């Protein structure tokens, strides 16, 4: 696997470049990923935390380190590390805010590292958080941030304070309290705190003692308690609709967000999802058609006994093909991909019906030759050109028709093939009749009429069967149309339920924060969040 971290998004002299070698690696990782970003200056020694998380034991931008997840089988742990952030203020530091924002968009958990305590200097260095509303777009809207942002973790290295009397989380909570008053310096003080409190769904704080002065036990145990928390609490990275992010999906997100920035636009979460949808829905149609071809290829043997047998085989294969498509697609705006699939499946049906007709014709035409050729040679030899020859011919003929009808699985063309054959021999048959000197004129007159009636009956049947087939085709067409709608409607219902669950989650989180601000007496901010809550509830 990966021997060590690799640069994923390079940041050099003002341009952001997705490393093709890193993407290639991502494109091959099919398993779902838990993505943890480790952010901060080099001096923070966050590099140690990264090695511990990777289970282990310069070019700027975002480095990645993919390893199997230690506690989640079938999942990959993706560590994202910021290199050079705030470390080149006298050099090429023009992309620092973009790097911070990208770490937020790509992760499940966002670990921010700093040294000492949370003081004025600590907050100023975290100014990037106040630029998120200007560097990230939710809809194709910072109020939606909490619905997709990673959980926030603040690690304090070499914690100098001595804190229950005061736990780390309580320390962080107090550190995030706002200042009353409307002075400029106050708004400056409150901005980053408001951003942290309103943008991230969960917050967690960890403090660490100095490593040395082996390493001091307390430190080793704090790092262990940290890694354990991440291994057990960090969630699989997901996008709207509960889409779980794996390698190809992460690759897509990186390209979309980086291309957006390099194009002078803002990285947009909804756009990233729509881009992924174009790729995966196209693939879903292919997978569905492939499944259809496979099933029909193993279950269909032309000619079929009847048309209904063919239509029923197509009906089952089509139902399964649609299930495959529905399961593998998402955000099929205007249902364009499904409409394409429907068109392709209808063409498949028509082709199979044409082939079925051709196969039946071949089979019957062959049996016709095998069964009736002898009689044809007897007639030519003049075996029936004798007294009473007509009645021996008619009986022989009837016996052969019976044999023909007894042949198995002749297909839908059985009747048409035989009648067309008999029609062509009608003249030859009449000759034998009119030539048989043992029959009275009246008897011949009767025979001619019988054959005439028998023929009209036949044409009658074929006409009916032709109308019947047209009805069966129009029927199956309606069934297919209704089957596509049935499965789509079910999927949309499941999507509706999933979205509601997501919105209820967001609502509960916003209510908790909103009420806190209220109790803390921050009327203005509380009302602002009340407005955010109202917009959400209307949409719900």
Q: Report the run of H or E that residue 16 belongs to, with start and end.
A: strand 15-18
Q: Give the distance from CA 219 to its chain's centroid.
A: 44
Domain boundaries, the chain: 1-240, 241-540
Within 407-440, where are the H helices? Answer: 414-435
Q: Are strands 15-18 and 76-83 parallel, antiparallel or unpaired?
A: unpaired
Å resolution of this model? 1.8
* Phi, psi at 156, each rounded to 5°: -110, 105
Q: CA-to-CA distance for 437 and 446, rounded, in angstroms?
A: 15
Task: List Cβ neighbours of 243 (8 Å cut-off, separation of 6 or more).
Answer: 249, 273, 276, 330
Is 250 within 8 Å of 237 (Cβ atoms)? yes
Question: Residues at the annotated binding site?
Answer: 40-47, 81-85
Identify the sign of the CA torsion 238, 240, 242, 245. Answer: negative
What is the bridge-based pairing of β-strands 238-239 and 243-244? antiparallel
Pairing of strands 109-115, 33-39: parallel
Length of the chain equals 540
Q: Rounded to an integer, what distance in angstroms lies between the CA atom of residue 118 and that of residue 129?
A: 15
| 3-class DSSP string for 431-485 | HHHHHCCCCCHHHHHHHHHHHHHHHHHHHHHHHHHHHHHHHHHHHHHHHHHHHHH
Task: At 4, give phi and psi (nearest 5°).
Answer: -165, 180
- Give whole-number Cα distances, 356 to 303, 305, 311, 413, in Å: 5, 10, 11, 9
Token duo for residue 315: 């009906």
How far, in Å, CA of 115 to CA of 159, rounded? Answer: 7
DSSP 316: H
* Segments of 214-332 assigned E as strands: 238-239, 243-244
Backbone angles phi, psi at 185, to 5 degrees: -65, -25
Q: What is the dihedral of CA 382, 384, 388, 390, to 10 degrees?
A: -130
Place of tokens 């006409």: 463
- Pair of tokens at residue 503: 């919105």
Q: Scanning the structure block, which residue is given the tokens 């975290």?
A: 126
Task: Give the three-class secondary structure for 108.
Answer: coil
Beta bridge partner(s), residue 106: none
Cα 30 to Cα 104, 286, 327, 329: the distances in Å are: 22, 19, 17, 17
Give the integer Cα–Cα distance in Å for 223 and 43.
17
Q: Which residues pair with 39 in a beta bridge?
A: 112
Query: Which residues partner with 210 through β-bridges?
Result: none
Distance CA 249, CA 23 (A): 10
Beta strand pairing call for 76-83 and 33-39: parallel
d(CA 529, CA 526): 5
Contact yes or no for 337/285 (Cβ under 8 A) = yes
SS3 of 118-159: the string is CCHHHHHHCHHHHHHHHHCECCCCHHHHHHCCCEEEEEEECC
Mention every residue, 6+ apart, whose C-beta is less than 8 A from residue 292.
Answer: 317, 318, 320, 321, 345, 348
Short-list 105, 124, 76, 157, CA closest to 269: 105
Cβ-contact 289, 321 below 8 angstroms: yes
Q: Mapping DSSP to helix (H, G, I), strand (E, B) and coil, where does residue 350 land?
A: helix
Q: C-alpha dihedral over 389, 393, 395, 398, to 10 degrees?
A: -160
Comparing CA positions, the residue from 122, 117, 113 lying closest to residue 159 is: 117
Question: From CA 48, how far away is CA 113, in angstroms rounded?
Answer: 11
State residue 237 phi and psi, 5-degree precision: -70, 130
Chain centroid, CA 96 distance in Å: 34
Q: Is 30 helix (H, G, I), strand (E, B) or coil?
A: coil
**Dist. CA 33–CA 23, nearest whole Å:** 15
Locate tokens 């829905």: which residue?
Answer: 281
Third-level CATH fold of 1-240 = Rossmann fold (3.40.50)
User: What letter would DSSP give residue 19?
Assistant: -
Neighbours of 128 (CB within 10 A): 22
CA dist 489 and 494 (Å) reads 9
Helix (H) / strand (E) element for 38: namely strand 33-39
Closest among 224, 229, 252 to 239, alpha carbons compared: 252
Contact 520, 177 (CB under 8 A): yes
What secondary structure does DSSP assign to 63-87, as a single string?
EEEEEE-SSSTT-EEEEEEEESTTT
One-letter-per-residue 3-state SS of 295-312: HHHHHCCCCCCCHHHHHH
Q: What tokens were used for 364?
A: 């019957």
DSSP 326-338: HHH----GGGHHH
For residue 264, is the peptide bond before it cis, meaning its omega torsion is within 30 degrees of 0?
Answer: no
For residue 97, the number of C-alpha atoms closer than 13 Å in the C-beta half-sphere is 14
Q: Does domain 241-540 have CATH number 1.20.1000.10?
A: yes
Helix (H, G, I), strand (E, B), or coil: what is residue 513? helix
Binding residues for GTP, by number, are: 40-47, 81-85
Q: How large is the angle between the packed helices 441-519 and 307-328, nearest 10 degrees?
A: 10
Q: How many CB atoms lie within 10 A of CB 403?
A: 13
The three-state secondary structure class of 104 is helix
193: nearest Cα among 208, 174, 207: 174
Please report which helix (H) or strand (E) contains residue 7, including its range.
strand 6-12
Cα–Cα dist 108/231, whole Å: 12
Residue located via tokens 């149609």: 285
CA distance 189 to 186: 5
* Beta-bridge partners for 474: none
CA distance 518 to 513: 9
CB of 204 closer than 8 Å to CB of 152: yes
3-state secondary structure (DSSP) of residue 41: coil
Q: Is residue 95 within 8 Å of 77, Cβ to Cβ?
A: no
User: What SS3 state is found at 114?
Assistant: strand
The answer to whether 332 touches 283, Cβ cutoff 8 Å, is: no
Output Rg (C-alpha) for the chain, integer angstroms: 39
């Amino acid at each position: 696997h990966m021997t060590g971290p690799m640069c994923l998004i390079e940041n050099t002299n003002g341009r952001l470049m997705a490393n093709p070698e890193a993407l290639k690696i991502l494109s091959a990782i099919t398993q779902p990923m838990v993505v943890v970003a480790i952010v901060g200056l080099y001096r923070t020694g966050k590099s140690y935390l990264m090695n511990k998380l990777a289970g282990k034991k310069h070019t700027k931008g975002i480095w990645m380190w993919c390893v199997p997840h230690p506690k989640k089988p079938g999942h990959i742990l993706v560590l994202l590390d910021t290199e050079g952030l705030g470390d080149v203020e006298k050099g090429d530091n023009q992309n620092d805010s973009w790097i911070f924002a990208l770490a937020v968009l790509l992760s499940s958990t966002f670990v921010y590292n700093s040294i000492g305590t949370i003081n004025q200097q600590a907050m100023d260095q975290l100014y990037y958080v106040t630029e998120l509303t200007h560097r990230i777009r939710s809809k194709s809207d910072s109020a939606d941030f909490v619905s997709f942002f990673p959980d926030f973790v603040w690690t304090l290295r070499d914690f100098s304070l001595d804190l229950q009397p005061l736990t780390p989380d309580e320390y962080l909570t107090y550190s995030l309290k706002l200042k009353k008053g409307t002075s400029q310096k106050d708004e400056t003080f409150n901005l980053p705190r408001l951003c942290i409190r309103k943008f991230f769904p969960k917050k967690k704080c960890f403090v660490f003692d100095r490593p040395v002065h082996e390493l001091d036990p307390e430190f080793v145990q704090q790092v262990a308690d940290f890694c354990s928390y991440i291994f057990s609490n960090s969630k699989t990275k997901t996008l709207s609709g509960g889409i779980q992010v794996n390698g190809p999906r992460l690759e897509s997100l990186v390209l979309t967000y980086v291309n957006a920035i390099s194009s002078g636009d803002l990285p947009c979460m909804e756009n990233a999802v729509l881009a992924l949808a174009q790729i995966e829905n196209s693939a879903a149609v292919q997978k569905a058609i492939a499944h259809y071809e496979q099933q029909m290829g193993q279950k269909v043997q032309l000619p079929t006994e009847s048309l209904q047998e063919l239509l029923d085989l197509h009906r089952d294969s089509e139902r399964e093909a649609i299930e495959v498509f529905i399961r593998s697609s998402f955000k099929d705006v205007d249902h364009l991909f499904q409409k394409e699939l429907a068109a392709q499946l209808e063409k498949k049906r028509d082709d199979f019906c044409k082939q079925n007709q051709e196969a039946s014709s071949d089979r019957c035409s062959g049996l016709l030759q095998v069964i009736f050729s002898p009689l044809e040679e007897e007639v030519k030899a003049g075996i029936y050109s004798k007294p009473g020859g007509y009645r021996l011919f008619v009986q022989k003929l009837q016996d052969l028709k019976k044999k023909y009808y007894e042949e198995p699985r002749k297909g839908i063309q059985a009747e048409e093939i035989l009648q067309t054959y008999l029609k062509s021999k009608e003249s030859m048959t009449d000759a034998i009749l009119q030539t048989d000197q043992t029959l009275t004129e009246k008897e011949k007159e009767i025979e001619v009429e019988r054959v005439k009636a028998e023929s009209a009956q036949a044409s009658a049947k074929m006409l009916h069967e032709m109308q019947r087939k047209n009805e069966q085709m129009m029927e199956q067409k309606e069934r297919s149309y209704q089957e596509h709608l049935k499965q789509l409607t079910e999927k949309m219902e499941n999507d509706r339920v999933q979205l509601l669950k997501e919105q209820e989650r967001t609502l509960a989180l916003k209510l908790q924060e909103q009420e806190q601000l209220l109790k803390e007496g921050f009327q203005k901010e509380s009302r602002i969040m009340k407005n955010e809550i109202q917009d959400l509830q209307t949409k719900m």
